[PDB]
C-alpha cells in the first residue's frame, strides 16, 4: 500500500512529464487540501491554475525524481525540474533561458489511494536570482 502509493506518485510525475495536468488531478480526492508556503489551504482550482500556468510557461519541462520514500499513508519525493523559461509565470517574464529547480512534494493518501493532503517546499530562487 505504501508501495501502491509510491507508484501513484510516479504516475503523477509521468503525467507532468507529458504535460498532462489532468493526469495529476485525477489522483486527488474530492476533499483534497493543498497547503501554501504558510500552511494556509489553497483551493484546488487555484492549484490547477498554477499548474496549468507552469505547463504553459515551461513547456519542455522534465521532472527527475531524485528520491522517494513512503511510510504509512505518506509519500515524500525530492524532484528536480529542468526547463526553458518560455512563458510568463507568476508575473515573471520569460527569459528564454534554461532554468532548473529542486523541490519536495509531500502527499497524504486515503485508504483508497487518493490524495487527501498535499504539501510542497520549493526553492524557486533560480527564477528570481
Ligand X SMILES: COC(=O)[C@@H]1c2cc3c(c(O)c2[C@@H](O[C@@H]2O[C@@H](C)[C@H](O)[C@@](C)(O)[C@H]2OC)C[C@]1(C)O)C(=O)c1c(O)ccc(O)c1C3=O
List residues binding a copy of itself (CB under 8 A): 2, 37-39, 66-67, 69-72, 74-76, 78, 80, 102-104, 106, 119, 121-126
Q: Judged by CB under 6 A, which of 6, 8, 75, 81 binds ligand X?
A: 81
Please name which of 57, 34, 56, 38 lies closest in space to residue 47, comparing C-alpha atoms.
34
Closer CB to ligand X, residue 60 or residue 72? 60
Task: Write phi, then psi, for 105 (nearest 5 degrees).
Answer: -120, 130
- Measured from the Cβ of residue 98, the count of other Cβ atoms closer than 10 Å reads 11
Is residue 33 part of the contact set for ligand X (CB under 6 A)? no
**Alpha-carbon 46 to chain mean position:** 13
Closer CB to ligand X, residue 50 or residue 114? 50
Q: Judged by CB under 6 A, which of 26, 33, 51, 76 binds ligand X?
A: 51
Least distance from ligand X to the Cβ atom of residue 39, Å: 11
Residue 111 interacts with, from a copy of itself, ligand X, none (CB under 5-8 Å by kind):
none
Q: Alpha-carbon distance 7 to 107, whole Å?
A: 12
Q: Alpha-carbon distance 53 to 23, whole Å?
A: 15
Q: Alpha-carbon distance 8 to 51, whole Å?
A: 18
Residue 8 interacts with, from ligand X, a copy of itself, none (CB under 5-8 Å by kind):
none
Q: Which stretch binds ligand X (CB under 6 A): 67-75, 92-100, 115-123?
A: 115-123
Amino acid at each position: 500500500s505504501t508501495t501502491a502509493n509510491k507508484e501513484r506518485c510516479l504516475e503523477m510525475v509521468a503525467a507532468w512529464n507529458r504535460w498532462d495536468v489532468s493526469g495529476v488531478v485525477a489522483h486527488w480526492a474530492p476533499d483534497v487540501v493543498h497547503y501554501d508556503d504558510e500552511d494556509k489551504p489553497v483551493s484546488a482550482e487555484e492549484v490547477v491554475r498554477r499548474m496549468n500556468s507552469a505547463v504553459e510557461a515551461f513547456p519542455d519541462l522534465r521532472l527527475d525524481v531524485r528520491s522517494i520514500v513512503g511510510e504509512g499513508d505518506r509519500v515524500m519525493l525530492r524532484i528536480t525540474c529542468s526547463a526553458t523559461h518560455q512563458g510568463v509565470f507568476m508575473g515573471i517574464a520569460p527569459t528564454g533561458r534554461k532554468v532548473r529547480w529542486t523541490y519536495l512534494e509531500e502527499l497524504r493518501f486515503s485508504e483508497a489511494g487518493k490524495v487527501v493532503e498535499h504539501w510542497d517546499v520549493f526553492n524557486f530562487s533560480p527564477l528570481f536570482r
